[PDB]
Tab-separated table of C-alpha atoms and ligand atoms in Angstrom:
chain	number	residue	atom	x	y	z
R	1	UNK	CA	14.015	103.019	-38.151
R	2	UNK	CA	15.799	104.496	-41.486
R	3	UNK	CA	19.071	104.879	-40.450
R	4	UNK	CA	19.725	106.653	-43.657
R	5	UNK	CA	16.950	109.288	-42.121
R	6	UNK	CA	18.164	109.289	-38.400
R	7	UNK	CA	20.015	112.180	-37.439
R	8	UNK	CA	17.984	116.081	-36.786
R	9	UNK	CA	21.475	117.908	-37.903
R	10	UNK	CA	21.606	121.708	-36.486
R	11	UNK	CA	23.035	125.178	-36.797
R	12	UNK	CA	24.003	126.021	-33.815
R	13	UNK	CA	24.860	129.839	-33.031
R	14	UNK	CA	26.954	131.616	-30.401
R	15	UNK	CA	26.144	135.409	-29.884
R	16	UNK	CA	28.522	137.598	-28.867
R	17	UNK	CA	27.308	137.278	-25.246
R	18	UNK	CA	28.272	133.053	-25.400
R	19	UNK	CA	31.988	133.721	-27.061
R	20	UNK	CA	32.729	136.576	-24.137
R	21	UNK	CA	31.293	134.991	-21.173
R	22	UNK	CA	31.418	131.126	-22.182
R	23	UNK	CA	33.971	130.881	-24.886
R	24	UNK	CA	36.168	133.386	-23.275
R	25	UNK	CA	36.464	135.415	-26.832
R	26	UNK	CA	38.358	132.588	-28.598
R	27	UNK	CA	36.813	129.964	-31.060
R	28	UNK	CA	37.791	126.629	-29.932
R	29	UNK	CA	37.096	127.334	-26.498
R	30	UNK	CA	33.441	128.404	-27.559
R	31	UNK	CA	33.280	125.333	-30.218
R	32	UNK	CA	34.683	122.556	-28.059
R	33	UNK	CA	31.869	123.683	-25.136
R	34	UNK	CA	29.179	122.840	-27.383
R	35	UNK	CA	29.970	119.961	-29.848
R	36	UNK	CA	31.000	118.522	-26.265
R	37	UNK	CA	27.287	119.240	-25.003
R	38	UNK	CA	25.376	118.662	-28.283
R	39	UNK	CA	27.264	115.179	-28.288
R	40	UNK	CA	26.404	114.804	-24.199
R	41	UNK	CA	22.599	115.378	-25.476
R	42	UNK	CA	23.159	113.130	-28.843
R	43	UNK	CA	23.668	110.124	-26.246
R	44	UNK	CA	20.788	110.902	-24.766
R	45	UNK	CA	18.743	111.036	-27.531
R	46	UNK	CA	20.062	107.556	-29.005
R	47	UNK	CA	19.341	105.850	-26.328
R	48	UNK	CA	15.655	106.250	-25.965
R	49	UNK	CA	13.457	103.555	-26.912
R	50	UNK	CA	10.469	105.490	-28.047
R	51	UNK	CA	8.361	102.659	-28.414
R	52	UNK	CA	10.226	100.658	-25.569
R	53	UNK	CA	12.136	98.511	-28.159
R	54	UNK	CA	13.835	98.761	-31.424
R	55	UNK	CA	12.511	102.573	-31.941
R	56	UNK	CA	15.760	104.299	-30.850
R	57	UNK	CA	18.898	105.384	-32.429
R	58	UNK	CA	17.763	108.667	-33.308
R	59	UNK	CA	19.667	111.665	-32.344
R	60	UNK	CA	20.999	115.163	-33.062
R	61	UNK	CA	24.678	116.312	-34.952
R	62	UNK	CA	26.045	119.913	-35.414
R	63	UNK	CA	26.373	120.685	-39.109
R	64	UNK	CA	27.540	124.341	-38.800
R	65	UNK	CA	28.701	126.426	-35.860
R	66	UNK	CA	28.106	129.947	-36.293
R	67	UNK	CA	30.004	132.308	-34.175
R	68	UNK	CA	29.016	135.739	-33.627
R	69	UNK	CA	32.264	137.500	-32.243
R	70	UNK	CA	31.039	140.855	-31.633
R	71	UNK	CA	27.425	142.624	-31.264
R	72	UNK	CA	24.886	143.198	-34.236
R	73	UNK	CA	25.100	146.630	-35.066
R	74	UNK	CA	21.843	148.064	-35.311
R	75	UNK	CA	19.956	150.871	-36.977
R	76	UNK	CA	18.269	153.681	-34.276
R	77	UNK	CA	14.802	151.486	-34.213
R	78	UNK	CA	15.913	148.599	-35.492
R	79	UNK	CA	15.946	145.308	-33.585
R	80	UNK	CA	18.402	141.722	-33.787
R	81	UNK	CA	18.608	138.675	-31.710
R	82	UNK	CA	22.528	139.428	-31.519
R	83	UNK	CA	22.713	143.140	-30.866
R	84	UNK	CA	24.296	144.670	-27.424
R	85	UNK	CA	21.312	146.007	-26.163
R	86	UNK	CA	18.579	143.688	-24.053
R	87	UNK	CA	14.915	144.363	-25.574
R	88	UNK	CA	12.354	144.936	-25.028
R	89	UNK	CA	14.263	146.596	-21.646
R	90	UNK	CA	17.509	147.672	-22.726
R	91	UNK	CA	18.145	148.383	-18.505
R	92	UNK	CA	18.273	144.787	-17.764
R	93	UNK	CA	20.650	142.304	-18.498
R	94	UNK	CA	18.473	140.178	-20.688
R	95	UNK	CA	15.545	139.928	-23.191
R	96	UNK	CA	12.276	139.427	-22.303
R	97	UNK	CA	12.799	135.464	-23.850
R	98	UNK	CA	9.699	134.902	-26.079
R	99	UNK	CA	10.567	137.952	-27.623
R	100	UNK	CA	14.308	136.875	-28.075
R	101	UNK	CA	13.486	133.391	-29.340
R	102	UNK	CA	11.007	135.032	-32.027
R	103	UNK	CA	13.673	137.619	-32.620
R	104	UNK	CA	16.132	134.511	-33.366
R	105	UNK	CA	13.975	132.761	-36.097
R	106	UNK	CA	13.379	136.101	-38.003
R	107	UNK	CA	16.990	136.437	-38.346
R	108	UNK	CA	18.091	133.382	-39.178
R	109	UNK	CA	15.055	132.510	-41.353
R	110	UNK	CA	17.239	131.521	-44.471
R	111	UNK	CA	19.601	129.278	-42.710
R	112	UNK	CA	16.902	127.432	-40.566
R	113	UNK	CA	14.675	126.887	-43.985
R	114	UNK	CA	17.497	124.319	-44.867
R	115	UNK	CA	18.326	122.339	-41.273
R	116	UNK	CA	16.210	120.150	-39.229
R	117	UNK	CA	17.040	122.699	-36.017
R	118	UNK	CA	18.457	126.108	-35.606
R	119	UNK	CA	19.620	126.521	-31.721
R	120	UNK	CA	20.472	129.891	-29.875
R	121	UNK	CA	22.942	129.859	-27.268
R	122	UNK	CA	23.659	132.695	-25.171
R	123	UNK	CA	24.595	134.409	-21.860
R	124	UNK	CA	21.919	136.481	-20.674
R	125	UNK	CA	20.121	136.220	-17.382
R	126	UNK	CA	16.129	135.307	-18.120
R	127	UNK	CA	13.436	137.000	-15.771
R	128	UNK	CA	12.393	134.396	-13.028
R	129	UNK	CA	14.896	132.018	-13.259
R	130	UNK	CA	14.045	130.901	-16.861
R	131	UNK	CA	16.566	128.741	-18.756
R	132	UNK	CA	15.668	128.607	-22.089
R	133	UNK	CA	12.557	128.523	-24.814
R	134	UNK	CA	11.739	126.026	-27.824
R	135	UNK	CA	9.145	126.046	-30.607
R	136	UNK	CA	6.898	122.267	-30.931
R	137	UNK	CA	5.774	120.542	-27.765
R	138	UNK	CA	3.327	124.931	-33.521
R	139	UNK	CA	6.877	124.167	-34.301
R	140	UNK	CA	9.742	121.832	-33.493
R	141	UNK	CA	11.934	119.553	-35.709
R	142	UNK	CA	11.652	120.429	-39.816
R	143	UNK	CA	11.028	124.121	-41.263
R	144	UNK	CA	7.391	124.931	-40.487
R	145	UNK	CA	6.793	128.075	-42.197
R	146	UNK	CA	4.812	130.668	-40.133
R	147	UNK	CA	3.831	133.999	-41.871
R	148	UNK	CA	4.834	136.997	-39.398
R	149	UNK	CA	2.691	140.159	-40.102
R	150	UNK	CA	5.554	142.319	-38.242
R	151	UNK	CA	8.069	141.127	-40.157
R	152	UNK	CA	6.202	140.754	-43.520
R	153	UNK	CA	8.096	137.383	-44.332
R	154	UNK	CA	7.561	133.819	-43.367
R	155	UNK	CA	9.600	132.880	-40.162
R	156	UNK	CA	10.189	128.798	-39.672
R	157	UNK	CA	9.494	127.660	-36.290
R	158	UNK	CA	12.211	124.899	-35.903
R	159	UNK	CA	14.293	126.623	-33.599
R	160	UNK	CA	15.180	126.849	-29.767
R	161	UNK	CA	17.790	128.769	-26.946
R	162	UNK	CA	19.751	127.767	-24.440
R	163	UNK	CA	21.415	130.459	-21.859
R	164	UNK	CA	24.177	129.257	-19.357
R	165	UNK	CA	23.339	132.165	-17.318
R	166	UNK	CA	21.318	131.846	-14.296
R	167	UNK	CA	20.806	134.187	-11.163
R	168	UNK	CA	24.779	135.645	-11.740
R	169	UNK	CA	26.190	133.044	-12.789
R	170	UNK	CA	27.524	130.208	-14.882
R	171	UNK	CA	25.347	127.532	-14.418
R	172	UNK	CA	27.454	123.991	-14.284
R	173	UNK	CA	27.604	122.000	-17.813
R	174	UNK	CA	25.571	119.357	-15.774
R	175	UNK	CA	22.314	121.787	-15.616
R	176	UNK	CA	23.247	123.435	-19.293
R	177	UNK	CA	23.161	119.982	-20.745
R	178	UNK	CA	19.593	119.219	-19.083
R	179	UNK	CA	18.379	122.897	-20.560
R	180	UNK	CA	19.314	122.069	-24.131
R	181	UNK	CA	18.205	118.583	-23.975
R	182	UNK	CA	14.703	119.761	-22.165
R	183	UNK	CA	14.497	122.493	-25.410
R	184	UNK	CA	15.130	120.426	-28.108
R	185	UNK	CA	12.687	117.425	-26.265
R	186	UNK	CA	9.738	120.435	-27.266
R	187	UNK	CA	10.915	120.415	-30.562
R	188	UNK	CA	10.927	116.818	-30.861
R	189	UNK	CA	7.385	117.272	-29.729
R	190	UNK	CA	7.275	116.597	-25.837
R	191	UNK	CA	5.067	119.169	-23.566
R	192	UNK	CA	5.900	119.139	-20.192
R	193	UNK	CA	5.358	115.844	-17.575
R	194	UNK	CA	2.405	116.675	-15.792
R	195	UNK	CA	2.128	116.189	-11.485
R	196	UNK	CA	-0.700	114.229	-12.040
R	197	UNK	CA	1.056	111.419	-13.948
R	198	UNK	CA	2.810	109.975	-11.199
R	199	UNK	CA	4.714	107.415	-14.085
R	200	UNK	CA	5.642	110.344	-15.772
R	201	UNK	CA	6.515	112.239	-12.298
R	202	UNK	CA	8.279	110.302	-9.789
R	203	UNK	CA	9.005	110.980	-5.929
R	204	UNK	CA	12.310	111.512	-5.023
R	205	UNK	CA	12.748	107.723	-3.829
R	206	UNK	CA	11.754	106.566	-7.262
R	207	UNK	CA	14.433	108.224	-9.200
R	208	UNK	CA	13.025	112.269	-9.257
R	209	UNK	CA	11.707	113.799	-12.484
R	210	UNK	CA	11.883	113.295	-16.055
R	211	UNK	CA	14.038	115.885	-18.059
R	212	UNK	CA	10.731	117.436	-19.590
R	213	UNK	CA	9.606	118.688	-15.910
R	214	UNK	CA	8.321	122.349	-16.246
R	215	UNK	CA	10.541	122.883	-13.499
R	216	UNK	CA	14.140	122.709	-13.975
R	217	UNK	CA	15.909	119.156	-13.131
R	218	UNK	CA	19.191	119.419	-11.799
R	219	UNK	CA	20.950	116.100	-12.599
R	220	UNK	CA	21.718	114.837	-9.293
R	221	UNK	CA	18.738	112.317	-9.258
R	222	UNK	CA	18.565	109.157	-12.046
R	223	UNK	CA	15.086	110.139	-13.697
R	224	UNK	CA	16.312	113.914	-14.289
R	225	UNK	CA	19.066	112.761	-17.719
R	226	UNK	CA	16.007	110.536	-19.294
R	227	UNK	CA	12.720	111.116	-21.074
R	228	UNK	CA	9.403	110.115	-19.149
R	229	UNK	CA	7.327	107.588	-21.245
R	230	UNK	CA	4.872	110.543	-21.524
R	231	UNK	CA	7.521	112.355	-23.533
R	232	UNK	CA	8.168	109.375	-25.511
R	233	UNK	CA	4.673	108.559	-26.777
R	234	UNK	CA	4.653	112.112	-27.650
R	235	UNK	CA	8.174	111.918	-29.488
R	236	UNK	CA	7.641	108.754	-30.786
R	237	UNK	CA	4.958	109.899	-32.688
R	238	UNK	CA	6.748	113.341	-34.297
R	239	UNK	CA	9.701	110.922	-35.360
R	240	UNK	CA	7.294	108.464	-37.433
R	241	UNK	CA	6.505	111.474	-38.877
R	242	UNK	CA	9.072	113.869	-39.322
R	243	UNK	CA	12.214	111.650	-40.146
R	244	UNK	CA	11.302	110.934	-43.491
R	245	UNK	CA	11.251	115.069	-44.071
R	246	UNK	CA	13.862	115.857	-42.914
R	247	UNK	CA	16.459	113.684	-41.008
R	248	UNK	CA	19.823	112.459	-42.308
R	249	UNK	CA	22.370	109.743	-41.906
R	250	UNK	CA	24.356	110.246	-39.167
R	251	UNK	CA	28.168	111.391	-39.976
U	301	727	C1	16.050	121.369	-17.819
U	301	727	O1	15.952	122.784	-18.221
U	301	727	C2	14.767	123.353	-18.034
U	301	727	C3	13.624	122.672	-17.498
U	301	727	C4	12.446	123.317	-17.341
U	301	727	C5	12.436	124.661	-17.730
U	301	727	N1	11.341	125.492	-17.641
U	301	727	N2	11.840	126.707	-18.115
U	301	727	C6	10.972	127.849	-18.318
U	301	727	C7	10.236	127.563	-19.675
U	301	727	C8	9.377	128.743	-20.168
U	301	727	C9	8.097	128.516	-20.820
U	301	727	C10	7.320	129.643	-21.227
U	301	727	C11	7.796	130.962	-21.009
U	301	727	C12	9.035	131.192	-20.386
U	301	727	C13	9.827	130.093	-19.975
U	301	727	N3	11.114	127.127	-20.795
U	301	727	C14	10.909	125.835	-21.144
U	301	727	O2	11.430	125.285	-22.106
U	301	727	N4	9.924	125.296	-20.275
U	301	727	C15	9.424	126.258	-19.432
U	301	727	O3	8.573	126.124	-18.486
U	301	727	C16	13.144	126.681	-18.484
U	301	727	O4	13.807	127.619	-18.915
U	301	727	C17	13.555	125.313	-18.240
U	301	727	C18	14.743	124.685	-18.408
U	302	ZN	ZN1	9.632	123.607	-21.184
Protein backbone atom coordinates (compact mmCIF):
# COMPACT_ATOMS: atom_id res chain seq x y z
CA UNK A 1 0.00 0.00 0.00
CA UNK A 2 1.21 3.73 -1.07
CA UNK A 3 0.19 5.62 1.63
CA UNK A 4 1.11 8.65 -0.33
CA UNK A 5 -1.83 7.23 -2.84
CA UNK A 6 -4.41 6.10 -0.12
CA UNK A 7 -7.18 8.29 0.31
CA UNK A 8 -10.44 8.48 -2.70
CA UNK A 9 -11.02 12.38 -1.60
CA UNK A 10 -14.76 13.60 -2.63
CA UNK A 11 -17.07 16.47 -3.41
CA UNK A 12 -19.74 15.98 -1.63
CA UNK A 13 -23.06 18.04 -2.45
CA UNK A 14 -26.17 18.97 -0.48
CA UNK A 15 -29.27 20.02 -2.63
CA UNK A 16 -31.58 22.20 -1.45
CA UNK A 17 -33.83 19.29 -0.38
CA UNK A 18 -30.67 17.95 2.26
CA UNK A 19 -30.04 21.72 3.81
CA UNK A 20 -34.13 22.09 4.43
CA UNK A 21 -35.01 18.75 5.62
CA UNK A 22 -31.52 17.46 7.06
CA UNK A 23 -29.50 20.52 7.69
CA UNK A 24 -32.44 22.43 8.88
CA UNK A 25 -31.46 25.52 6.36
CA UNK A 26 -28.21 26.36 8.21
CA UNK A 27 -24.60 25.30 7.13
CA UNK A 28 -22.97 23.72 9.99
CA UNK A 29 -25.84 21.77 10.85
CA UNK A 30 -25.86 20.35 7.17
CA UNK A 31 -21.80 20.12 7.20
CA UNK A 32 -21.28 18.57 10.62
CA UNK A 33 -24.09 15.64 9.49
CA UNK A 34 -21.91 14.56 6.83
CA UNK A 35 -18.13 14.99 7.56
CA UNK A 36 -19.57 13.09 10.77
CA UNK A 37 -20.92 10.22 8.36
CA UNK A 38 -18.23 10.35 5.63
CA UNK A 39 -15.72 9.93 8.66
CA UNK A 40 -18.26 6.99 10.24
CA UNK A 41 -17.76 5.32 6.58
CA UNK A 42 -13.82 6.38 6.40
CA UNK A 43 -13.43 3.87 9.49
CA UNK A 44 -14.99 1.49 7.76
CA UNK A 45 -13.16 1.61 4.85
CA UNK A 46 -9.64 1.57 6.74
CA UNK A 47 -10.24 -1.19 8.36
CA UNK A 48 -10.75 -3.72 5.68
CA UNK A 49 -8.13 -6.07 4.91
CA UNK A 50 -8.72 -6.57 1.25
CA UNK A 51 -6.40 -9.23 0.90
CA UNK A 52 -6.92 -10.44 4.62
CA UNK A 53 -3.60 -8.81 5.75
CA UNK A 54 -1.55 -5.79 5.24
CA UNK A 55 -3.94 -4.54 2.20
CA UNK A 56 -5.97 -2.03 4.27
CA UNK A 57 -5.70 1.51 5.24
CA UNK A 58 -7.46 2.82 2.41
CA UNK A 59 -10.31 5.10 2.83
CA UNK A 60 -12.37 8.13 1.77
CA UNK A 61 -11.93 12.24 2.95
CA UNK A 62 -14.23 15.21 1.98
CA UNK A 63 -12.25 17.77 0.02
CA UNK A 64 -15.12 20.22 -0.73
CA UNK A 65 -18.67 20.50 0.57
CA UNK A 66 -20.92 22.06 -1.76
CA UNK A 67 -24.10 23.41 -0.47
CA UNK A 68 -26.96 24.14 -2.56
CA UNK A 69 -29.21 26.52 -0.36
CA UNK A 70 -32.06 27.01 -2.55
CA UNK A 71 -33.56 25.20 -5.84
CA UNK A 72 -31.91 25.31 -9.43
CA UNK A 73 -33.83 27.60 -11.33
CA UNK A 74 -34.67 26.19 -14.49
CA UNK A 75 -35.54 27.17 -18.03
CA UNK A 76 -39.43 25.97 -19.26
CA UNK A 77 -37.85 22.46 -20.69
CA UNK A 78 -34.89 22.47 -19.14
CA UNK A 79 -33.81 19.85 -16.59
CA UNK A 80 -31.10 19.88 -13.20
CA UNK A 81 -30.32 17.41 -10.56
CA UNK A 82 -31.03 20.38 -7.98
CA UNK A 83 -34.17 22.00 -9.30
CA UNK A 84 -37.66 22.03 -7.18
CA UNK A 85 -39.48 19.97 -9.36
CA UNK A 86 -39.23 15.82 -9.19
CA UNK A 87 -38.64 14.44 -12.92
CA UNK A 88 -39.41 12.67 -14.78
CA UNK A 89 -42.96 13.01 -12.52
CA UNK A 90 -43.02 16.35 -11.21
CA UNK A 91 -46.45 14.91 -9.00
CA UNK A 92 -44.35 12.83 -6.82
CA UNK A 93 -42.07 13.62 -4.27
CA UNK A 94 -39.00 12.23 -5.92
CA UNK A 95 -37.07 11.41 -9.16
CA UNK A 96 -37.29 8.44 -10.85
CA UNK A 97 -33.36 7.66 -9.34
CA UNK A 98 -31.39 6.42 -12.42
CA UNK A 99 -32.54 9.35 -14.02
CA UNK A 100 -31.48 11.63 -11.01
CA UNK A 101 -28.08 10.01 -10.57
CA UNK A 102 -27.40 10.54 -14.48
CA UNK A 103 -28.89 13.97 -14.08
CA UNK A 104 -26.14 14.52 -11.18
CA UNK A 105 -22.97 13.61 -13.26
CA UNK A 106 -24.08 15.86 -16.23
CA UNK A 107 -24.11 18.70 -13.95
CA UNK A 108 -21.33 18.39 -12.10
CA UNK A 109 -19.18 17.01 -14.96
CA UNK A 110 -16.33 19.68 -14.45
CA UNK A 111 -15.94 19.26 -10.79
CA UNK A 112 -16.06 15.36 -10.80
CA UNK A 113 -13.29 15.36 -13.84
CA UNK A 114 -10.84 16.50 -11.00
CA UNK A 115 -11.89 14.19 -7.68
CA UNK A 116 -11.69 10.57 -7.15
CA UNK A 117 -15.76 10.70 -6.18
CA UNK A 118 -18.53 13.15 -6.58
CA UNK A 119 -21.51 12.10 -4.01
CA UNK A 120 -25.23 13.37 -4.09
CA UNK A 121 -27.02 13.68 -1.00
CA UNK A 122 -30.53 14.47 -0.80
CA UNK A 123 -34.06 14.21 0.70
CA UNK A 124 -36.36 12.76 -1.64
CA UNK A 125 -38.42 9.65 -1.19
CA UNK A 126 -37.22 6.84 -4.01
CA UNK A 127 -40.04 4.58 -5.61
CA UNK A 128 -40.04 1.12 -3.76
CA UNK A 129 -38.17 1.79 -0.92
CA UNK A 130 -34.88 2.56 -2.79
CA UNK A 131 -32.03 4.23 -0.86
CA UNK A 132 -29.63 5.31 -3.10
CA UNK A 133 -27.66 4.56 -6.67
CA UNK A 134 -23.77 4.36 -7.55
CA UNK A 135 -21.85 4.05 -10.82
CA UNK A 136 -18.87 0.81 -10.80
CA UNK A 137 -19.79 -2.50 -9.22
CA UNK A 138 -18.98 1.04 -15.95
CA UNK A 139 -17.92 3.52 -13.39
CA UNK A 140 -16.81 3.91 -9.80
CA UNK A 141 -13.65 5.46 -8.22
CA UNK A 142 -11.45 7.87 -10.88
CA UNK A 143 -13.13 10.04 -13.81
CA UNK A 144 -14.22 7.52 -16.45
CA UNK A 145 -15.31 9.57 -19.24
CA UNK A 146 -18.60 8.40 -20.89
CA UNK A 147 -19.81 10.29 -24.06
CA UNK A 148 -23.69 11.16 -23.55
CA UNK A 149 -25.48 11.62 -26.96
CA UNK A 150 -28.35 13.68 -25.00
CA UNK A 151 -26.19 15.83 -23.55
CA UNK A 152 -23.59 16.14 -26.40
CA UNK A 153 -20.60 16.21 -23.81
CA UNK A 154 -18.68 13.57 -22.01
CA UNK A 155 -20.22 12.81 -18.50
CA UNK A 156 -17.61 10.93 -15.87
CA UNK A 157 -19.11 8.10 -14.16
CA UNK A 158 -17.39 8.40 -10.67
CA UNK A 159 -20.25 9.47 -8.85
CA UNK A 160 -23.06 8.17 -6.42
CA UNK A 161 -26.41 9.42 -4.05
CA UNK A 162 -27.43 8.95 -0.91
CA UNK A 163 -31.17 10.06 0.29
CA UNK A 164 -32.05 10.05 4.11
CA UNK A 165 -35.55 9.83 3.12
CA UNK A 166 -37.39 6.68 3.30
CA UNK A 167 -41.24 5.83 3.36
CA UNK A 168 -41.93 9.59 5.26
CA UNK A 169 -39.33 9.83 7.01
CA UNK A 170 -35.85 10.45 8.29
CA UNK A 171 -34.21 7.38 8.23
CA UNK A 172 -31.75 7.01 11.52
CA UNK A 173 -27.88 8.00 10.83
CA UNK A 174 -27.35 4.21 11.63
CA UNK A 175 -29.20 3.08 8.19
CA UNK A 176 -27.87 6.49 6.25
CA UNK A 177 -24.36 5.49 7.13
CA UNK A 178 -24.92 1.77 5.73
CA UNK A 179 -26.56 3.54 2.36
CA UNK A 180 -23.51 5.66 1.66
CA UNK A 181 -21.08 3.09 2.60
CA UNK A 182 -23.15 0.30 0.40
CA UNK A 183 -22.90 3.23 -2.67
CA UNK A 184 -19.54 4.07 -2.55
CA UNK A 185 -18.62 -0.07 -1.98
CA UNK A 186 -20.09 -0.08 -6.05
CA UNK A 187 -17.81 2.46 -6.82
CA UNK A 188 -15.00 0.85 -5.24
CA UNK A 189 -16.08 -1.97 -7.46
CA UNK A 190 -18.27 -4.44 -5.29
CA UNK A 191 -21.68 -5.89 -7.00
CA UNK A 192 -23.99 -7.11 -4.71
CA UNK A 193 -23.40 -10.50 -2.23
CA UNK A 194 -25.20 -13.07 -3.88
CA UNK A 195 -27.82 -15.78 -1.72
CA UNK A 196 -25.99 -18.41 -3.10
CA UNK A 197 -22.65 -17.58 -1.43
CA UNK A 198 -23.51 -18.54 1.90
CA UNK A 199 -19.69 -16.97 3.07
CA UNK A 200 -20.66 -13.99 1.51
CA UNK A 201 -24.43 -14.29 2.95
CA UNK A 202 -24.77 -15.36 6.40
CA UNK A 203 -27.93 -16.56 8.52
CA UNK A 204 -28.96 -14.50 11.11
CA UNK A 205 -27.04 -16.71 13.83
CA UNK A 206 -23.83 -16.15 11.96
CA UNK A 207 -23.72 -12.46 12.15
CA UNK A 208 -26.60 -11.40 9.16
CA UNK A 209 -25.48 -9.84 5.88
CA UNK A 210 -22.65 -8.08 4.48
CA UNK A 211 -23.17 -4.25 3.81
CA UNK A 212 -23.21 -4.95 -0.09
CA UNK A 213 -26.64 -7.05 0.32
CA UNK A 214 -29.05 -5.95 -2.54
CA UNK A 215 -31.35 -5.61 0.18
CA UNK A 216 -30.93 -2.96 2.63
CA UNK A 217 -28.95 -3.95 6.04
CA UNK A 218 -30.08 -2.26 8.95
CA UNK A 219 -27.14 -2.27 11.42
CA UNK A 220 -28.51 -4.11 14.22
CA UNK A 221 -26.68 -7.44 13.28
CA UNK A 222 -22.47 -7.64 13.29
CA UNK A 223 -22.01 -8.68 9.48
CA UNK A 224 -24.35 -5.65 8.27
CA UNK A 225 -21.18 -2.51 9.12
CA UNK A 226 -18.45 -4.89 7.18
CA UNK A 227 -17.62 -5.92 3.64
CA UNK A 228 -18.19 -9.72 2.67
CA UNK A 229 -14.90 -11.29 1.34
CA UNK A 230 -16.83 -11.37 -1.99
CA UNK A 231 -16.78 -7.59 -1.94
CA UNK A 232 -13.27 -7.57 -1.02
CA UNK A 233 -11.77 -9.71 -3.79
CA UNK A 234 -13.75 -7.51 -5.94
CA UNK A 235 -12.37 -4.20 -4.20
CA UNK A 236 -9.18 -5.45 -3.72
CA UNK A 237 -8.67 -5.72 -7.15
CA UNK A 238 -10.08 -1.94 -8.30
CA UNK A 239 -7.62 -0.54 -5.53
CA UNK A 240 -4.39 -2.31 -7.12
CA UNK A 241 -5.57 -0.60 -9.85
CA UNK A 242 -7.02 2.59 -9.36
CA UNK A 243 -4.87 4.09 -6.43
CA UNK A 244 -2.04 4.88 -8.40
CA UNK A 245 -4.63 7.20 -10.71
CA UNK A 246 -6.02 8.77 -8.62
CA UNK A 247 -5.78 8.48 -4.75
CA UNK A 248 -4.03 10.88 -2.37
CA UNK A 249 -2.36 11.07 0.97
CA UNK A 250 -4.62 11.24 3.53
CA UNK A 251 -4.93 14.86 5.34
C1 LIG B 1 -27.32 -0.27 2.76
O1 LIG B 1 -28.07 0.57 1.81
C2 LIG B 1 -28.60 -0.06 0.77
C3 LIG B 1 -28.47 -1.47 0.53
C4 LIG B 1 -29.03 -2.04 -0.55
C5 LIG B 1 -29.74 -1.18 -1.40
N1 LIG B 1 -30.40 -1.57 -2.54
N2 LIG B 1 -30.95 -0.37 -3.00
C6 LIG B 1 -31.64 -0.30 -4.27
C7 LIG B 1 -30.49 -0.23 -5.34
C8 LIG B 1 -30.99 0.02 -6.77
C9 LIG B 1 -30.37 -0.63 -7.92
C10 LIG B 1 -30.90 -0.39 -9.22
C11 LIG B 1 -32.01 0.48 -9.40
C12 LIG B 1 -32.62 1.12 -8.30
C13 LIG B 1 -32.11 0.90 -7.00
N3 LIG B 1 -29.41 0.75 -5.05
C14 LIG B 1 -28.23 0.16 -4.75
O2 LIG B 1 -27.17 0.75 -4.59
N4 LIG B 1 -28.43 -1.25 -4.78
C15 LIG B 1 -29.70 -1.56 -5.19
O3 LIG B 1 -30.25 -2.72 -5.27
C16 LIG B 1 -30.69 0.71 -2.22
O4 LIG B 1 -31.08 1.86 -2.41
C17 LIG B 1 -29.87 0.18 -1.15
C18 LIG B 1 -29.31 0.78 -0.07
ZN1 LIG C 1 -26.57 -1.81 -4.63
Amino acid sequence: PDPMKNTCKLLVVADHRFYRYMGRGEESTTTNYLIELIDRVDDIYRNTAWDNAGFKGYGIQIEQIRILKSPQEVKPGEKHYNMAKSYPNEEKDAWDVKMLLEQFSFDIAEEASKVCLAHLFTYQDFDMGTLGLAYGGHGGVCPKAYYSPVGKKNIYLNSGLTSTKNYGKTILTKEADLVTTHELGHNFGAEHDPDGLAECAPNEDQGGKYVMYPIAVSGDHENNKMFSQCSKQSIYKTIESKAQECFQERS
